[PDB]
Amino acid sequence: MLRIAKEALTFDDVLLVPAHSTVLPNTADLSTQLTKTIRLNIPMLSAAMDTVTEARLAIALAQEGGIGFIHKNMSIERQAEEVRRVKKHESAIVRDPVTVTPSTKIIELLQMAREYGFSGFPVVEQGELVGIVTGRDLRVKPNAGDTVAAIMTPKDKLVTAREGTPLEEMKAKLYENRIEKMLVVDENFYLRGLVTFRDIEKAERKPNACKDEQGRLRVGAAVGAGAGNEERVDALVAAGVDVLLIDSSHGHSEGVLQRIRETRAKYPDLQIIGGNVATAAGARALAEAGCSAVKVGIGPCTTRIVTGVGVPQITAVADAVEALEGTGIPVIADGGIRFSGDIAKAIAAGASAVMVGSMLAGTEESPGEIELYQGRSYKSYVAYKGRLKEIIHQQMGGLRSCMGLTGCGTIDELRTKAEFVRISGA
Amino acid sequence: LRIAKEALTFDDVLLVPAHSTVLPNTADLSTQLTKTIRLNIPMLSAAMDTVTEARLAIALAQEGGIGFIHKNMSIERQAEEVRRVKKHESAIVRDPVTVTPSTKIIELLQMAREYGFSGFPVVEQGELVGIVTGRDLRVKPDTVAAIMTPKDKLVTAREGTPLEEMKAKLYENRIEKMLVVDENFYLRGLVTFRDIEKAERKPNACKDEQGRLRVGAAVGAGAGNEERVDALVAAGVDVLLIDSSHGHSEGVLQRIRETRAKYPDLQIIGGNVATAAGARALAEAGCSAVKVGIGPGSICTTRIVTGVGVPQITAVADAVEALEGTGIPVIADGGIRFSGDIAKAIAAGASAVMVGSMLAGTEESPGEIELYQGRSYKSYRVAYKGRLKEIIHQQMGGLRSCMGLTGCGTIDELRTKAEFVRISG
Amino acid sequence: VVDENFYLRGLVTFRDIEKAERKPNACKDEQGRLRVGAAVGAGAGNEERVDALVAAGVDVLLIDSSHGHSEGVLQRIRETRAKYPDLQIIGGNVATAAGARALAEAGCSAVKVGIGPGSICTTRIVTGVGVPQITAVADAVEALEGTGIPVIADGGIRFSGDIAKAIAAGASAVMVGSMLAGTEESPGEIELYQGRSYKSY
Amino acid sequence: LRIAKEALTFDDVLLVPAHSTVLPNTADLSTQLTKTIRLNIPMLSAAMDTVTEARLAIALAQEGGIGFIHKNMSIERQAEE
Ligand SMILES: O=c1[nH]cnc2c1ncn2[C@@H]1O[C@H](COP(=O)(O)O)[C@@H](O)[C@H]1O
């Protein structure tokens, strides 16, 4: 007998029923929990694709509320760097300022002063910040061949802030210490950058930046389920990554489940996402192995045509959610998302966020550099799509519009309150 | 039947390659726009509302050519565009946070906690009167006027001051901020060692004898433009574009004769013509340059509608030959599709080319970025072509190769030494 | 089968000599080895490459530039010729009578003609320079009418009729690219795509 | 205006047929490439990385013409080809 489990639905099969609503679109709460502990401001993830997510894009996205996942087609030593660039990224901090050493001749200092001003030259000998020289230090006339070491400000009398310090704290330190520039060190008092009042103003204001408990941007990064990835993991976790993505084309494989169990045994507090599954059991299987969230999407596609396996996206999500009802383990809709409507449907199926790839490739912040070809602008490594900021705004405009229509003020209500109609092709 | 001759366009000729001591990267793209104005690249931007405004006219000047502000706007804004270009210095911070002599010290401390007491410039109706700093409030003497630093002890630079001279002023006066005023001591901006440092370096800027970017501006040949001209000439436009759809009309020739007697020294471009007779006519009227192009525009609506036109190559050579002695240059206007067309235009005798379609849709052109379908466009829609600088490089890349192939190291050698072959389809 | 230093190179049986494909039209040298050319650029720093190929027994050397009529090409050609008085050299590309004698006097053994007509013709359009191929060939041929130095028609050969026209214009041989790219023996791997066979790079 | 001449391409001409004692299968396709090198067919393969390597340069030589190994490779491999 023909073994058909059920009937299965994709995006184009359903529409959301509009409801009574006290919800204005610009007042909708777009936030939602990615894991039990990580909470996004917009419910969006960027695919760990070499064409989609690198350090550049994953920052832009966190500033706007979501999280990017550094793709894994790069060395361990380099993937760990991309993770670190995001966590420590403050556009307000001037990162490559001109420094000197105690060995620097004062003669060379007046030369540089004529080229950067006596606002302040950081003195470093072998990375350790040891002091700074200002024009107020250069009073009285240097005898022939003096060096900075005699006139500089010592380490003890410096006013610094640590990296990851909030920005108004720095303003407070800057104002109350009646200074115009303040050095930013690290745990070991290594010079990391500097900050000014103006550099804080020209830092564009991202009120919905998705950050950690210490105000650093959040970042994810992806690894394989094959053997031998443990070292990359150790390197990434070392780089301070917020969430780890173990991506395979079959999350319900026992080998995936094992590397997860191992990674979970090794890093009990690390937020881990496993994927991809498309069934009630595949999600429950992944949860047991120790996921913090589960990514859903098997041929949302080329996978369906070559292997014949797949599940339409809407029922796949509903089944996973139905199985995870009560665990606080969220579902991620991955792939097949063309417009804002698919996003809205995804969440209303129960999904807590979505992952997109094609939609982001070609954005300014995406990998590749802009190249003009046949009078058109493209991203050379695809159609150049412009700034990510707008694509998000355009997409979230749509989502916001939807929540007003369905009377859902928050994401969780949309995942629970919104209703569907089953529809035909016509 | 009066058929004067046969006339040739771009697709009709190829440039013949010659002995060459010219590497493309060593070729001299400069050329004289008029006897007095000399370009660094032989490119003008069309005075089209979709192409040239202050923003793009700046970008092109930074690149070696000159943009022509279109005339489809009120004077008060057009003369403004001419200023926006002439006065543009990328290093100057404009619209900084200021106070007035009336500002309550109470209000002074609030802003200080949100911008720092580095110094708030004090202006009384735009006129710079002083600056109040944190040393002034802890020092004490109520309002800002009582604690502010007076006009006498201020260190300023005038607008248009070179950057190295400002840098010297900042060091020799031991300051990190220096305010920028104009002729009437009105505040225009400020400069620090850092903002002069991040100022983009444009070594091929077409600048005037005073280091300001050069700007053109276009007006029509009708009556009632006299006030517009005077406004632009007042606004410091470098060269004036008198553009008509028939440069060989007696009314054009007259208004040109008039403007020239009025501004004996003002550089004027008249157009458009496509004949030897149309060319001398415009020169005798007193043009400094002659623009050629009746019929070849991109969105070529003439001919078809009117039956009139000249294939662009024949027109240019004919005008060039008629002006062989006057030191008055010719411009090839419209119909430039690829960089090969540029090369052919110049080798026909042109001293520069004017382009529209090639530039419309760059970031710097008018219009807003808009995402449509799944691609980027400039919405007023046109295809977003990215930054102008990239296009210019590709286009001049092409021209350099041609000159390398043809053994012409300078534009002028290309205009005189390069040969053609005629070809079929 | 050994070589000059008695290093093993292979073996032969009565049978393997029997299945060896018989190519009666092989272009072989005065020593029955297949003839081979090799191409280098006209820039500086190729001197070591040339010497390596000449050492490797290349039969004829191809000095190819996008402008064979450049003085630098003419010079590097003058240099290589004084160095290998006997080495067969092909210079290109030109498209004029003047470009042709220039290359011959520099010491070319053959002259390659073709500025503008390549298949993926990116010149002209971009640079405005070129010559329709027939006129170029006849012009170079006529300029070399006495030198016993042959001309090659390079690029733009679409069909066999074009070959015939090229030669009848004066060409002694033709050089083709597009017509050959994608044959089994060209570089690339066989790949099945869509539902058809392609050579995947 | 300096227009040297008119210039012709393939589509511009046809070859005129003449009296003929020549059968196609009896035609001599050989020709001198240089004073010293003589081809059997009048064909060279372009020195293009997508066209000529040792493999194709062998096949063409077997057929009467000469292939030209492209230069987009390290010497040690080109001299090898
Ligand atoms: O409606 C029109 N008819 C004829 N020519 C025009 C029209 N609008 C603009 N032009 C000219 O077309 C030129 C630009 O040609 P393009 O480089 O091919 O786009 C400019 O110099 C304009 O003066």
Ligand SMILES: O=c1[nH]cnc2c1ncn2[C@@H]1O[C@H](COP(=O)(O)O)[C@@H](O)[C@H]1O
């Ligand atoms: O980028 C290019 N521009 C111009 N000619 C080229 C380029 N690449 C290869 N060629 C030449 O094109 C010829 C092949 O022409 P085809 O027979 O039509 O494919 C060869 O002789 C090459 O030297």
